[PDB]
Design a protein around this ligand. Structure first.
Ligand SMILES: Nc1ncnc2c1ncn2[C@@H]1O[C@H](CSCC[C@H](N)C(=O)O)[C@@H](O)[C@H]1O
Ligand SMILES: Nc1ncnc2c1ncn2[C@@H]1O[C@H](CSCC[C@H](N)C(=O)O)[C@@H](O)[C@H]1O
Lengths: 347, 343
């Protein structure tokens, strides 16, 4: 017999039993589905979001194009609503097949087609015509975390026609300074009785954006306080915006509603199309448990200045606080640095 | 600027404090991901403090495997040990420990060696130690080979009278029903759309840490379908990994009827009267422990069909499970025995 180099069994001790359905299946595909896709599909509210927005844009003469088909659920929705043709693009090989198999298992093998490629190499030749609708779910815990704006923009410039409706329409990344003792106990140490340990603080990570779930935390489960109104880091119109519409450095003047300790900046985002909303805000994901597991929220520990040891950002209600937001080149990573009163070039 | 410097993996536009710029990334990741949480697990710290002060004389020489930050050695020194030698494999962690030791003026009580305990020879020690101190437990108790590393030191460096801390370790397992976990790990479909083919890929083999699902078991609602399954127990002063059979079987009687979505894995460490538990029923107020360890999970498939079959419990009936250990006993797997298995 033969075993693919990336077969699941290869990752597993000889003494441990593996079901035939898993043995020769590629590790990455298994990891992809088990870690993300199962949680995505049980995000009913997410599925309901895309079904409703498609429902008001799909005619039997509607040509649909989806970026990142994965399992093909969204592409199935387009066809389910009676679309003329659906072409779904998927970057990895094994996800491409899995989509097709889901497409045969259901009705739509004639209606929906899945191309193995990145949307970057998708050419007008690969499409029947310019699509009426562009479909996309390529949002991460950070909205542009998996470069959603860049992939749509490339496709928007090359493959779409004027009348093309882009789903979804709007996207906004928010930031909130929060007090959260529970998080603080995971990320800070002073000492144990007589023993001084504050030197450990030399190493505290004030720079990295961190996904709540990866370190075992769900903000809906943890008690915390929002020390201010949401901060609109940036808005994006997917049918007109570019990644340079997001200035690589911005300054935000935040008014503290409540006094407390800003242990961390909490990062969430909302996606809008007409009256329909996709929210990453923990207030809206209380009952959407699968969403907190797929997207969740992101955190960044705040340091007030550049001392040898981190300085706590203490908010005093009514008093005003100034933050410098620095994006990376691809606008995929960002950072919130409190302005002093010389890491920042605040003025 | 070291090749492993923290700045070097950060965008040029993002600001990095001087205390972090030239610091090795691995050190930062380690301290931030684990050490902070360890140090705020005060039950854990209190566990070792109480077991230590029961054995530490001003005549007691202490040897710690895996110093890391070296807090436990600071405890042994604080309790007035005559000499403490703490061994640490990470070069950057070893220096971090030394600094903590200077900050508490115990520079001459505690010595930190940059090596693996495998390389620790009697030459490196003043005397065969009176006390052996270890914290090398993972979310899976033997997940970090805590048993093997102690056995090597036990065979080569210790003396008959050497008290090993901690004494006992028990790896438990419980079959549980958990609707929240099920929604994260399975899919049937969406309305008329059938997505059951997705189930072909459901990972039934891998042991996944609960926090890597993003889950803390104390926050999520679940049912235990039977009494705890003692997979194995180890005496760190006499057991070898060969004492753990490569394959064990278990008569598991269902206390309750339900769906065994998964096998929950926790453990308990014992020394005299003192207990270190990973059971989520004991970590309800120990939020740092659930973050540094938490629990483990394995999804259960009942047989070997083209699709996963739910393991369903009927109260009062028996369910035989086969447990297979990897060679180093670091990894294990629970498989239901049908009326892949040797049963
Ligand atoms: N430029 C790109 N081109 C094609 N596929 C992409 C892509 N970027 C990400 N992807 C793929 O899109 C998927 C993101 S999630 C899958 C969404 C799917 N339509 C659903 O709702 O079920 C991943 O599988 C990823 O491999
Ligand atoms: N055989 C081994 N020998 C020496 N150090 C080890 C080791 N196995 C693991 N370690 C190290 O021990 C540490 C495990 S965690 C440190 C726990 C420490 N007692 C404290 O509470 O601060 C890690 O730094 C690891 O690199």
């Amino acid at each position: 017999g033969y075993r693919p180099p990336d077969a699941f069994v290869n990752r597993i001790d000889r003494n441990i039993p593996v079901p035939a359905r898993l043995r020769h299946t590629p590790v990455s595909l298994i990891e992809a589905v088990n870690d993300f896709h199962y949680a995505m599909m049980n995000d009913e509210e997410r599925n309901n979001f895309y079904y409703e927005v498609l429902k008001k844009h799909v005619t039997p003469e509607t040509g649909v194009l989806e970026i990142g088909a994965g399992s093909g659920l969204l592409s199935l929705m387009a066809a389910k609503l009676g679309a003329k043709w659906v072409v779904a693009v998927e970057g990895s090989e094994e996800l491409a097949k899995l989509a097709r198999e889901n497409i045969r298992a259901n009705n739509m093998e004639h209606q929906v087609k899945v191309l193995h490629m990145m949307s970057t190499e998708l050419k007008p030749k690969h499409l029947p015509e310019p699509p009426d609708v562009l479909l996309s779910e390529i949002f991460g815990t950070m909205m542009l975390g998996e470069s959603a704006l860049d992939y749509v923009v490339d496709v928007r410039n090359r493959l779409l026609k004027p009348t093309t409706k882009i789903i979804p329409q709007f996207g906004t990344q928010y930031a909130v300074p929060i007090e959260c003792d529970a998080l603080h106990r995971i990320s800070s140490v002073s000492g144990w009785r007589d023993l001084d340990l504050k030197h450990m603080m030399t190493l505290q990570d004030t720079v990295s954006i961190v996904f709540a779930k990866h370190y075992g935390i769900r903000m809906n489960s943890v008690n915390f306080r929002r020390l201010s109104d949401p901060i609109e880091l940036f808005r994006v119109d997917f049918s007109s915006s570019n990644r340079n519409d997001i200035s690589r450095r911005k300054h935000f003047d935040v008014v503290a509603k409540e006094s407390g300790t800003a242990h961390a900046m909490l990062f969430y985002w909302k996606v809008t199309d007409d009256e329909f909303v996709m929210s990453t805000d923990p207030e809206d994901t209380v009952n959407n448990f699968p969403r907190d597991m797929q997207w969740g929220q992101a955190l960044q520990l705040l340091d007030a200045s550049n001392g040898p040891l981190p300085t706590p950002v203490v908010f005093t209600e009514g008093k005003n606080y100034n933050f410098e937001c620095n994006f990376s080149g691809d606008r995929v990573i960002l950072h919130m640095q409190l302005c002093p009163e010389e890491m920042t070039e605040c003025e």
